[PDB]
């Protein structure tokens, strides 16, 4: 009966070294991600990750090929509770949220002309949200001595919160603001959201978080929708992989609880690992499908950029990204690749030639 427990202990002891090596490699990757990967789109960030990984291979330091900081930091409950607060289910939104919630040492900048980050953070915070826009010194001092979370607008007209933002607290823990001594209740959080794309000192104290979509976002959206609705086998294997990951996390939590109970009172893991290894063998299929369905993505970027360029020649010819996503959905809601690109062209023409003059 103890043979299975001994085998599990031996497997854990053997995998501890690989876990530690992957931990330090993934920590390098994650830190360099929240620093140098917060203001660039997907294509150049992919090239930069390629160069970074080839330099790491020159250094030859052990890491994880399937590295994902999303499961490293954000659990499922936190991800759902943040997705219901206003944010989408997209990966870029999840990762910049992770950058925001990991920016403890330097205040997390909220660059959003659409002002969605301020709304979602206020919805998450609740009653503690206090909004200002750059009297105001007295309001900030009152908020500091009260203990409410402060979000300040109009970041382009900012130099009086230097000590507070640099945490120059004086302990006997006091805050020096203006020309008087102030106190901090301890529940103080200072955040900044703006809409105007910044002084160099402000850049130093903040970590830049980007929101603006682009043609890289177009490629990401078309790839996601293709993998999510084009191939039902892809949908079923993605659902099986997600369920297997959730089951593995639940089994790890149950095993930890069982170990704690055994410590207090003094098979399944192998099957879960085998199922996970069997399910994670479809990554090359996803890569091949992405390679096949990439000319459609390039043509999609070309079409969207062209339609944006028609808006340059006349101010009454705007093009909507939501409309483009809707028509991409509509061409397939009702040679597979050649036929689907042909139908996408026909649908886009027949739906976007109704809003143009004859010329």
Swiss-Prot record:
Residues 73-274 are annotated as: AAA 5. It is found in: Cytoplasm, Cytoskeleton. Residues 225-283 form a coiled coil. Belongs to the dynein heavy chain family. Cytoplasmic dynein acts as a motor for the intracellular retrograde motility of vesicles and organelles along microtubules. Dynein has ATPase activity; the force-producing power stroke is thought to occur on release of ADP. Required to maintain uniform nuclear distribution in hyphae. May play an important role in the proper orientation of the mitotic spindle into the budding daughter cell yeast. Probably required for normal progression of the cell cycle. Present with 195 molecules/cell in log phase SD medium. Dynein heavy chains probably consist of an N-terminal stem (which binds cargo and interacts with other dynein components), and the head or motor domain. The motor contains six tandemly-linked AAA domains in the head, which form a ring. A stalk-like structure (formed by two of the coiled coil domains) protrudes between AAA 4 and AAA 5 and terminates in a microtubule-binding site. A seventh domain may also contribute to this ring; it is not clear whether the N-terminus or the C-terminus forms this extra domain. The dynein complex consists of at least two heavy chains and a number of intermediate and light chains. Interacts with DYN3. This is Dynein heavy chain, cytoplasmic. It comes from Saccharomyces cerevisiae (strain ATCC 204508 / S288c) (Baker's yeast). The chain holds residues 3298 to 3693 of 4092 of the full protein.
